[PDB]
Amino acid sequence: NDCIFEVKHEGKVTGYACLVGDKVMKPAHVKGTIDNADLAKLAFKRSSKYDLECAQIPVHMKSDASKFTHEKPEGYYNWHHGAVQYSGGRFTIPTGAGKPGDSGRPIFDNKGRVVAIVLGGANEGARTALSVVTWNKDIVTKITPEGAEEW
Amino acid sequence: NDCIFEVKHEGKVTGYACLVGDKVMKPAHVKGTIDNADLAKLAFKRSSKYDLECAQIPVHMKSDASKFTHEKPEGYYNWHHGAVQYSGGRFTIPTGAGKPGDSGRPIFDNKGRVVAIVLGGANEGARTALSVVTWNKDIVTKITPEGAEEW
Amino acid sequence: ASHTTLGVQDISVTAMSWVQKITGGVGLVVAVAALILIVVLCVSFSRH
Amino acid sequence: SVASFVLLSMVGVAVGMCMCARRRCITPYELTPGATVPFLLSLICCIRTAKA
Numbered sequence: 381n382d383c384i385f386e387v388k389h390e391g392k393v394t395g396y397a398c399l400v401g402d403k404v405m406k407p408a409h410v411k412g413t414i415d416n417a418d419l420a421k422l423a424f425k426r427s428s429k430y431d432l433e434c435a436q437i438p439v440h441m442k443s444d445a446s447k448f449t450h451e452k453p454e455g456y457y458n459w460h461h462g463a464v465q466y467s468g469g470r471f472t473i474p475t476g477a478g479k480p481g482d483s484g485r486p487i488f489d490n491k492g493r494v495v496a497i498v499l500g501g502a503n504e505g506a507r508t509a510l511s512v513v514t515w516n517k518d519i520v521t522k523i524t525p526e527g528a529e530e531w
Numbered sequence: 532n533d534c535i536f537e538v539k540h541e542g543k544v545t546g547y548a549c550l551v552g553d554k555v556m557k558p559a560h561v562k563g564t565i566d567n568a569d570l571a572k573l574a575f576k577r578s579s580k581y582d583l584e585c586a587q588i589p590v591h592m593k594s595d596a597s598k599f600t601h602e603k604p605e606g607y608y609n610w611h612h613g614a615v616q617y618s619g620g621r622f623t624i625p626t627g628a629g630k631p632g633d634s635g636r637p638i639f640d641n642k643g644r645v646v647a648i649v650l651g652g653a654n655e656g657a658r659t660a661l662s663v664v665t666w667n668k669d670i671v672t673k674i675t676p677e678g679a680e681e682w
Numbered sequence: 683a684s685h686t687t688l689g690v691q692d693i694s695v696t697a698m699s700w701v702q703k704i705t706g707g708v709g710l711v712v713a714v715a716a717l718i719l720i721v722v723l724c725v726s727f728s729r730h
Numbered sequence: 731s732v733a734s735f736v737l738l739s740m741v742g743v744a745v746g747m748c749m750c751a752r753r754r755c756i757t758p759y760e761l762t763p764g765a766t767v768p769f770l771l772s773l774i775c776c777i778r779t780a781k782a
């Protein structure tokens with residue numbers, strides 16, 4: 381934990397950029413400059429398909445990036461605003477747990493490794509379906525439940 | 532039992548709808564107007580072959596969606612008139628347990644998921660076979676015994 | 683007229699190949715549609 | 731007039747049979763929760779998934 385950085389704006393934080401493996405994850409819909417000076421200077425390749433902005437970590441100096449994994453067994457995970465529960469192909473939370481302005485928050489498994497980065501959520505009544513950027517064995521994927529709004 | 536997601540659909544109660552997975556499911560032979568006065572306004576696709584009818588669950592009640600699964604190991608399952616046993620490729624209940632008006636009752640595994648939806652059945656003395664729809668991997672099926680009738 | 687009448691039936695001229703072409707195209711479309719219908723019917727009837 | 735009328739009616743019957751085939755080959759996938767329609771069958775029968 382504590383490896384993430386808030387992407388700062390003029391007067392408030394609009395999202396969170398996470399360090400995973402050797403890439404500086406950052407959602408693309410959120411805009412800002414990133415707090416840390418060096419990270420702001422990297423070339424961020426974008427993709428509207430996956431709503432992501434990533435760049436090679438200066439791994440010569442950043443040797444603290446979070447571990448990652450590709451398997452997502454159904455169970456319970458945590459995202460620093462509570463505990464996210466897995467079911468089928470959705471992530472659900474208590475309705476008030478999620479809030480705008482905290483998009484890009486990494487979510488971990490029980491062993492302290494990230495599995496997905498939240499982009500937004502759809503309030504389903506009691507639960508909130510999370511739109512996340514995860515990855516399978518090979519390549520990233522964007523699970524977007526119906527009616528999910530950006531954060 | 533421990534989770535309510537069913538709704539009736541007629542002033543004279545005959546048949547019920549369920550919130551299974553991402554579909555609101557109601558058997559075809561029953562007729563009426565699904566309550567809460569919004570679900571009945573949904574666009575419903577029907578198939579007289581399977582005696583089934585479905586519609587997309589509105590995002591409002593995605594939290595109320597019941598979990599479901601496709602495996603049906605030999606054993607005992609419970610519904611709202613007691614318990615059933617999936618013995619020898621058939622769902623059977625003790626005679627007199629079911630009666631007209633009982634279609635649309637789901638059938639649960641011990642973990643609370645849905646594995647079946649009852650349409651009716653026939654009796655052989657002390658026991659009674661069931662006519663039920665079920666879904667294997669990716670495809671629904673319907674199983675019916677000899678001399679059954681709609682409930 | 684020295685000859686007889688044109689013909690009591692279907693003595694339209696060559697370049698009725700236009701008729702043959704349009705009828706053949708419509709028949710091909712109908713045959714393809716019928717084949718698709720019967721193959722999906724066989725698939726749905728196998729399913730039980 | 732007769733030839734034009736029947737031919738357009740023939741293509742109408744063909745398109746109707748195509749629509750009926752699409753309906754009867756797609757409804758099993760519509761009823762089943764999970765929505766695992768393959769990419770190939772979605773393209774052939776001209777349907778789209780709920781996550782695209």
Ligand SMILES: CCCCCCCC/C=C/CCCCCCCC(=O)OC[C@H](COP(=O)(O)OCC[N+](C)(C)C)OC(=O)CCCCCCC/C=C/CCCCCCCC
Pocket residue numbers: 688689690691694700701704732
């Ligand atoms: C769903 C809809 C269903 C509705 C059903 C529709 C029914 C409508 C019809 C009723 C029929 C009307 C007939 C009117 C009475 C006429 C009687 C007649 O007096 O009959 C004249 C002769 C027929 O002689 P017969 O055999 O009866 O005598 C033998 C007599 N028996 C058989 C007893 C021995 O007729 C001739 O000979 C004249 C020959 C002239 C040939 C004209 C050629 C026209 C060709 C056009 C082709 C177009 C070009 C194609 C370009 C396309 C490019 C895309």
